[PDB]
Structure 1
């Protein structure tokens, strides 16, 4: 089963920072990163990447080091 990395809205990080982090960590374009940031902000969370459990563990670690609230879970 594939897994997903989820980023959760938090009250401290800047919207602008989160958009930048998605570009920096995943290479996403600015429209893509902005859309994911706004999904987190307006829905409370968003899937930001998908793949094997092991690969999502890395994405979670990278996001934590950037200061974002990230978890992973199995995709159903």
Structure 2
């Protein structure tokens, strides 16, 4: 299994990131906000998990929204 990681960046608005997580993944507002704050406070956070092919899509969707996203195998 793989995971998609979003990395903190100095340009994107906190409010925008919360919205992007809801729009792209259907997450609730408390869930999206929690992930956004984890990124901002820890520098990164797993935002989704699944097969390598599934995470490839999530990364591409996040890049199109302007967020710093990568994927890696889950240990």
| TM-score bin, normalised by smaller chain | over 0.9
2: distance between equivalents of 1:10 and 1:60?
15
For residues 54 and 42 of structure 2, the distance between their equivalents in structure 1, rounded to whole angstroms, comes to: 25
How big is the shift at 1:32? 0.0
> 1:63 deviation in Å?
0.1
Misfit runs of 4+, over 6 Å: none
Partner secondary structure for residue 20 of structure 1: helix
- Where structure 1 has 5 or more consecutive residues not aligned to the other structure, the ranges are none
Displacement, 1:20? 0.0
Give the deviation of 1:42 after TM superposition. 0.2
1:10 CA drift (Å):
0.1
Instruction: Classify the secondary structure of the residue corresponding to 1:71.
Output: strand
User: What is the DSSP-based 3-state SS (H/G/I as helix, E as strand, rest coil) of the residue aligned with 1:70?
Assistant: strand
Query: Where does structure 2 lack aligned partners over 5 or more consecutive residues?
Result: none
Cα shift at 1:40: 0.1
What RMSD over aligned residues (CA atoms) do the two structures have, in Å?
A: 0.1
- Counterparts of 1:27 and 1:58 in 2: how far apart (Å)? 15
